[PDB]
Homo-oligomer: A and B are copies of this chain.
Amino acid sequence: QEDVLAKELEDVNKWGLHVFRIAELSGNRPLTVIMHTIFQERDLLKTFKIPVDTLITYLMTLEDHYHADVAYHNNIHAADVVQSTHVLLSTPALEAVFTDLEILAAIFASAIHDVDHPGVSNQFLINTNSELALMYNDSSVLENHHLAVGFKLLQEENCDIFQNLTKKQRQSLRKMVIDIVLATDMSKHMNLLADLKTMVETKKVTSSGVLLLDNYSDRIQVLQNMVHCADLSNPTKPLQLYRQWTDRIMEEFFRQGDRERERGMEISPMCDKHNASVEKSQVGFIDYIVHPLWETWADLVHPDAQDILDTLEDNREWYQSTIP
C-alpha cells in the first residue's frame, strides 16, 4: 500500500493528480504527504534548513486542524489547492520569476488557507452572530481565522518550520502569506479579477519571454490570483475529479441550508436540497466566476494553460448537456 502511494505521488507535477486515492492510501494524510513530496521536489528543506521531523510534525498538526467531518473544506481540499498551486508555479511563463521565499509563501499559504473551516460561509457566520464574526468584525471572517490558526500552530512543540529563516525572511513571508490567504475571500474576487485583467492588458515580458514583475504590488497580485485560481480549480480538472468535488460542495451547502431552514432564515443560494439544480449551478459557477478567472490567467501565461482551459470548457459543455 505504501508502494502504491509512492507511485501515485510520482504524479505530483501533473494536473489531475489522483488526490482522493492519495488521501485513502496515506491514511487520510493527503496534505502531509503531498506537502512533504513538494518540499522535497523543490529542495525547500535544504534551502530553508527545515528539519524533516519539524516539517512532518507541523504538517500533521495543521492537517489535524482541518475538520474531517466537513465534506468539502477539509484536508483533501487543502492538499488539492497546494498541489494545484505547485503546478501553476512551474508554468513556463514564470520560470525564474519568483524567489524561493515567494514560492515557499505561496505553497504555505495554500496549505493553511482553509484550516479549521467549519463548513459554513462567511455570510452564515455573520447572520448567526457567531463568535468568529464577532472576533473579526464581519470582515473576511473565515480567511482571517485560517491565517491565525495556520500561524499559531507554528508555535506548537517542534512545529516552527521557519525556525532557520532570517528575521527579514520571516517578516516578508508572513506579510505575503497574509496577503495571499486574504485574497481567497470570494468577496474580493471581482476586484482581484479586474486587477488581473488590467495586468494582462499591460503585461511586460522579458527577453527570455517570462513575465516581468518588478515591484511588490505586481508580484503579490500574481501570487494572489495564482492561489485563487488553484482554490477555484475544481471545474478545470478531469471530470471524474470535478464530479467528486461537486458532490462534496453540494453536501456541505445542503448541510448549511438545513441549518438556515431550521432557524427560519432565508436559505442561501444553492443550499436548498429541496429546490436544488446542481447542474445549472455548476454551469452558472463556471460561466460567471471560474471561466472569467481562468481565461484571464490563461491570457497572462499564454499559451501555458491552454489545456487546462480546454478541460474547463469541456466540463462546462458536459454539465450543460445534462440539463435539457
Contact = CB atoms under 8 A, between A and B. Distances in A.
Interface of A: 134-139, 144, 147-148, 151-152, 174-175, 178, 182
A148 B132 CA distance: 10
A98 to B, nearest CB: 22
Main secondary structure of the interface of A (DSSP, over half): helix
A138 B152 CA distance: 13
12 contacts: A134-B148, A134-B152, A135-B135, A135-B148, A136-B144, A137-B144, A137-B148, A137-B178, A138-B174, A138-B175, A138-B178, A139-B178
A147 B151 contact: no
* Copies of this protein, total: 2
A182 B144 CA distance: 16
A144 B136 CA distance: 7
Nearest to A181: B137
A61 to B, nearest CB: 16
A136 B134 CA distance: 12
A227 to B, nearest CB: 16
Nearest to A174: B138
Contacts of A174: 138
A279 to B, nearest CB: 34
Contact of A137 (B134, B137, B138, B147): B147
A171 to B, nearest CB: 9
Contacts of A136: 144, 148
A162 to B, nearest CB: 12
Contacts of A137: 144, 147-148, 151, 178, 182
Contacts of A134: 148, 151-152
A145 to B, nearest CB: 9
A136 B145 CA distance: 8
A132 to B, nearest CB: 11
Contacts of A139: 178
A93 to B, nearest CB: 30
Contacts of A182: 137
A135 B131 CA distance: 13
A38 to B, nearest CB: 24
Which 5 pairs show the lowest CB-CB distances between chains A and B?
A137-B178, A137-B147, A135-B148, A137-B144, A134-B152
Contacts of A178: 137-139
Nearest to A131: B152
Nearest to A127: B171
A178 B137 CA distance: 7
